[PDB]
């Protein structure tokens, strides 16, 4: 109460209410899912549409040839962070002529996003990211939070009703490593489908897909390009 307006104010229970509140921005975003096999990393996102005549918000963003992200939370903060990730990747190619390792990029985000949590008048980033990448250490799915903490994941879901998607992903994760791409994307789509009201389904209007791996630069599939993946959820 007196402890909940400033990111510099610790509460007496050793919490920072502004960081917790910023995490609510991510829990109210639309769901997204990330998973990986031995060879590919996949992102699947639900796009929320403001009206029946609106396009559906972009949820998946290109970072570099080997890295893409999925977003939940404040879109403007997502773009600011995505721009920082882009620039760190461009810098590593410029200086070293090789892709920035995914875990090093994620450490950069952690360090960047921590700073405003400790200075008066600043605020946390109100965005959570799932990060799909491929490098010398194989495929990766990472998760970042407004607290500046980050996590290396076998699979993950964030956003609204993401708990259902996580439960699905726990249930089938022993299968993921050995899956071909098609199997892996289907698993991502089924996890995402658990987040929906019983009426409603995955369609070409509301689903977005991002894939990167051993043979495949980060690529986004929308609209008519998702139809192949949606057919034969059989």
């Amino acid at each position: 109460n007196q402890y909940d307006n400033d990111v510099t104010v610790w509460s007496p229970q050793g919490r920072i209410h502004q960081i917790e509140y910023a995490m609510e921005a991510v829990k109210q975003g639309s769901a997204t899912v990330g998973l990986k096999s031995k060879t590919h990393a996949v992102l699947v996102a639900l796009k929320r549409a403001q009206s029946e005549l609106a396009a559906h918000q972009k949820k998946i963003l290109h970072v570099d040839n080997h890295i893409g992200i999925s977003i939940a939370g404040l879109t403007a903060d997502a773009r600011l962070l995505c721009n920082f990730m882009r620039q760190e990747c461009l810098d590593s190619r410029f200086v070293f002529d090789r892709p920035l390792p995914v875990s090093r990029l994620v450490s950069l985000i952690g360090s960047k996003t921590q700073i405003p949590t400790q200075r008066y008048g600043r605020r946390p980033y109100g965005v959570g990211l799932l990060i799909a990448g491929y490098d010398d250490m194989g495929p990766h799915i990472f998760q970042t939070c407004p607290s500046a903490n980050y996590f290396d994941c076998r699979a993950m879901s964030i956003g609204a009703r993401s708990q259902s998607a996580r439960t699905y992903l726990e249930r089938h994760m022993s299968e993921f490593m050995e899956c071909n791409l098609n199997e892996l994307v289907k698993h991502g789509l089924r996890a995402l489908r658990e987040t929906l009201p019983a009426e409603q389904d995955l369609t070409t209007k509301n689903v977005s897909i991002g894939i990167v791996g051993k043979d495949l630069e980060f690529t986004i599939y929308d609209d008519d390009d998702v139809s192949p993946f949606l057919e034969g959820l059989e």
Binding site: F94, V95, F96, D97, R98, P101, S103, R104, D136, M137
Partner: protein, 216 residues
């Protein structure tokens, strides 16, 4: 540096099957004075990469400091990624170009040798940011005296064994001792293979002075 002070002369490099060898004498010259006769002008950068430098030795020591600390910083993370020989060569290209573009160069010409993922790497970078790769390299007077011998051998036989590359480097170092007034007959040879980087020395070449009696 506007005015180089203590300097080193040629560095040689040649790729062989399974690795790369570089050579450099152990002399820091101060003008024509052979001042510091036991200095290493080669650096082990990491397990896959080595560097030889001509030109200003203090500038080399600065690069050693900076590059060494960068390799430490990367090893602290323990994350399975290391700088390749190519990445180091890129970094150096950028650093040298940048210093040139401030009109304050690092007064060096360098030879980066490495072995990574079954490929030999050999690359040049100069104080202006001129950089390239080649099957053999030679800076300074080496460009005139050593490189012709290197390239002539490499044309007749592009793939050299380790012991052939080493014999060929010794021959070039002998010629340089004969004909470069800033050379010295005390050198190091550094080799990178699958097993890592080894620096040998101090070494000397045999010399022949028979021609001293063929004037009349």
């Amino acid at each position: 540096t506007q005015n180089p002070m203590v300097t080193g002369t040629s560095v040689l490099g040649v790729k062989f099957e399974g690795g790369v060898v570089i050579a450099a004498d152990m002399l820091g010259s101060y003008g024509s004075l052979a001042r510091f006769r036991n200095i290493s002008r080669i650096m082990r950068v990491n397990n896959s990469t080595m560097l030889g430098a001509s030109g200003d030795y203090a500038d080399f020591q600065y690069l050693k400091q900076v590059l060494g600390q960068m390799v430490i910083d990367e090893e602290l993370l323990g994350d399975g990624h290391s700088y390749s020989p190519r990445a180091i060569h890129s970094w150096l290209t950028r650093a040298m170009y940048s210093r040139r573009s401030k009109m304050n160069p690092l007064w060096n010409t360098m030879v980066i040798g490495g072995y990574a993922d079954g490929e030999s790497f050999l690359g040049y970078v100069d104080m202006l940011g001129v950089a390239y790769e080649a099957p053999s390299l030679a800076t300074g007077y080496g460009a005139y005296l050593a490189q012709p011998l290197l390239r002539e051998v490499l044309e007749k036989q592009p793939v050299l064994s380790q012991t052939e590359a080493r014999d060929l480097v010794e021959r070039c170092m002998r010629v340089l001792y004969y004909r470069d007034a800033r050379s010295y007959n005390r050198f190091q040879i550094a080799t990178v293979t699958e097993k890592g980087v080894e620096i040998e020395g101090p070494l000397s070449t045999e010399t022949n002075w028979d021609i001293a009696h063929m004037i009349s």
